[PDB]
Structures are given as C-alpha cells and as structure tokens.
Amino acid sequence: EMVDNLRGKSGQGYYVEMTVGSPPQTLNILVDTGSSNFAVGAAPHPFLHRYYQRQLSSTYRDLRKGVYVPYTQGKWEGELGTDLVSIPHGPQVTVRANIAAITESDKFFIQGSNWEGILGLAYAEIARPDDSLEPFFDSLVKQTHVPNLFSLQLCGGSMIIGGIDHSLYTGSLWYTPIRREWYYEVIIVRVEINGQDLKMDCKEYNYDKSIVDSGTTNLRLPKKVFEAAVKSIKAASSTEKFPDGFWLGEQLVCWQAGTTPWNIFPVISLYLMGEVTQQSFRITILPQQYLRPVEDVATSQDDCYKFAISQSSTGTVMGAVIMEGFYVVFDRARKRIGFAVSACHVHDEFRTAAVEGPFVTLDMEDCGYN
Numbered sequence: 001e002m003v004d005n006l007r008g009k010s011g012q013g014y015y016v017e018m019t020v021g022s023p024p025q026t027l028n029i030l031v032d033t034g035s036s037n038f039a040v041g042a043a044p045h046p047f048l049h050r051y052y053q054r055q056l057s058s059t060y061r062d063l064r065k066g067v068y069v070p071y072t073q074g075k076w077e078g079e080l081g082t083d084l085v086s087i088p089h090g091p092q093v094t095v096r097a098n099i100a101a102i103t104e105s106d107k108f109f110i111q112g113s114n115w116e117g118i119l120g121l122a123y124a125e126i127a128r129p130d131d132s133l134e135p136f137f138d139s140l141v142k143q144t145h146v147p148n149l150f151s152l153q154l155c156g157g158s159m160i161i162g163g164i165d166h167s168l169y170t171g172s173l174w175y176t177p178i179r180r181e182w183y184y185e186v187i188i189v190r191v192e193i194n195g196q197d198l199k200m201d202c203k204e205y206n207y208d209k210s211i212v213d214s215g216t217t218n219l220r221l222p223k224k225v226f227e228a229a230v231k232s233i234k235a236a237s238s239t240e241k242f243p244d245g246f247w248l249g250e251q252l253v254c255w256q257a258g259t260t261p262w263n264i265f266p267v268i269s270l271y272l273m274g275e276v277t278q279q280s281f282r283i284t285i286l287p288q289q290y291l292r293p294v295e296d297v298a299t300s301q302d303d304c305y306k307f308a309i310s311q312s313s314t315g316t317v318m319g320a321v322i323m324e325g326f327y328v329v330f331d332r333a334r335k336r337i338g339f340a341v342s343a344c345h346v347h348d349e350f351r352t353a354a355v356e357g358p359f360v361t362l363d364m365e366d367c368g369y370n
C-alpha cells in the first residue's frame, strides 16, 4: 500500500502526503535525505496552496524557540514546536514529532511544485538549531515498531518505510558504508566516463565530503572533478558543439522533438566503496539521467535539456538525477546504503543503467577526505 506514494515535478523534488495536527491537516512534504529538519509552511505565501495552521491543532505544543535553515538553494526561518504527524500512504502509525513552522522564506518554496513542506531524513548532527532537535525518522523509530530503514525509488516514485520492496528493483543490491551519520555520507573511489578513468587521487572525489541527497536535483561535483568530467564529456560528444552556457548548466540545448542524439553522450560510472576492504561496485548513469528535460509548451516543437551535472564547493552531492532509475536503500540499522537497478529506470535499446561489481583495487589509499 506504500508503492507509488511519491509524486513530483521534475527538478522540483519528490513529495509524500502527510498530515499534521489534531484534527489532521493534509500537506504534501518533499522527501529530503540531504537535511534533517521537518518544516512546513505555516503562513500564507504566493507559492503555497495551503499551510499549517497551528491555532487549529489542539495537540500543537510551542517550544518557544526560533530556527533558521539555509540550504544550497533557498532558506527559511520559523518557530519550533511539536505535534502529531501521520503518513496516510506510509506506515500506519502516528507520532509526535518536532515541526518547524515556517513564517518567512527566500527562494525556498517553488511556484507550482505542489508541496508545502520538507522532511529531512538525515541525522541529528546536521539538524538546526543543533543536534538536540530529534529528526522525524528518529522519532518514528523510537515511538513505533518500525525497523530502522527506509528506501526510495524515484522515477512519481515510492518511499518504503521499514523495509525493502523487491517488486521495486531487479538484480542485486550492492551496499556502500555510511561513513559517518550526519549527512548520508559515502565514499567514491573511482570515476569513469565512457569507461575512461578521470585519473585523480580518489580523495578528490570526496572533497569536502560526498552525500546522497534526494533533495538536490543535480549530480554536483567538486570543482576539480567537475572540470575534468566536463572535459571528458565534451570530448566524447565532440561531434556536436554546444555553448559554454550549456556546460555551466545555465542554458538549454534543444533538438527537434524525438531526435535527441543520446548515443553521442557518454555513460558515467561512479564507483562506490564496498563493505569489504578494497572492494567496490559501480553505478552507471546514462545521458537520459544527466541531461534533464525541461518542459515548456513554448519550446515544445523541440525537446530541450539542461546539463544536470554542476560544480560544488561543498563536496559531491548525488542528487535526484543520480538516484532516479535506482532503488536506494537507506539501511540506517546497518549503517549502509544499498543500490539496485530500479523497475522504473529510463534507457534505450542500446544501453542500460547498471549497478554491478565487484571491482578490486591494488592501491590501499583511504579515499575519505576526513
């Protein structure tokens, strides 16, 4: 009953239905493995269809404390409290959880996104104001019998809480360690484009850190890695020349509807650290994943795309365009992240996204930046 419980607009995140307060107030909530605060619009906003009305909830308790969260994109401020929360198409349990009532925001809410709040599924260490603010999922596990694990299939999509749904993937699940419980931090040991190694010290791939983040759209890479990746993708696709603005992820590239030259763009392989010494596996991404379609009736004689790999100064972010087409298991109990090929990945008659291994490495260097 939990399958297909996610919806979204491409590039604007995936959300699940929740209710807050007594009696229940229904809100759509973006599912974000890249942060740790549960926050909802709680005052009118031009982009909000509805908002949390605390005065209508008898179970709301005010914590008398402000809170501010600045993301990579957007920021909000609000007031902390607790209230009862349920997930109509998730586990059938109700829990009292911390809630940030958003009273002011900047470039956070998105016009036409259909969500009104955000659910930070990461660990308390990155919660604001500090790590004493118990995140939602921790409250859920403490207060119910739900196993300490959830999984995401981003396609619509599914968030499965408490277990793994085999109907949602094919082949084997491969696991990489959660290096530290704050973000869902992982370690990338190798990157290949078109099968060719980028040939960098593997610590470069994880400077400052590397995270798995359903709340970010792009694959974001450290400057040095990004520039190397772009050079290699340009080389592979050199039969066509695009404006610099495209590689900067600023402007679109368009082709006559139906004629996107997928075959001229390379596959990208990210090798993740395995659970055993010097073993790894790879996840492979097709251009259908990293060239993000931009819907616009005005340009609809064409198919137009943005380049959804972009530069970061805060480490690697494996965002939605990496997670789409994979079934991703956040196995908190065993401190590991699993990847498998999703039942709903996008590909063609020539190439298919994959999760595969094992791969061994002779060089024993720790790829963690520290």
Ligand SMILES: CCNc1cc(C(=O)N[C@@H](Cc2ccccc2)[C@H](O)CNCc2cccc(C(F)(F)F)c2)cc(N2CCCC2=O)c1
Binding pocket: 011, 012, 013, 030, 032, 034, 035, 036, 069, 070, 071, 072, 073, 074, 108, 118, 126, 127, 213, 215, 216, 217, 218, 219, 220, 310, 319
């Ligand atoms: C889905 C919308 N598209 C996005 C969203 C975000 C982004 O910053 N997402 C946030 C939250 C968010 C979710 C939805 C809307 C707005 C914010 C996520 O928590 C960051 N994790 C990491 C993080 C970073 C900083 C602070 C935190 C903290 F923990 F919350 F404090 C977390 C970056 C994008 N970018 C930017 C350029 C490339 C790209 O794809 C595109």
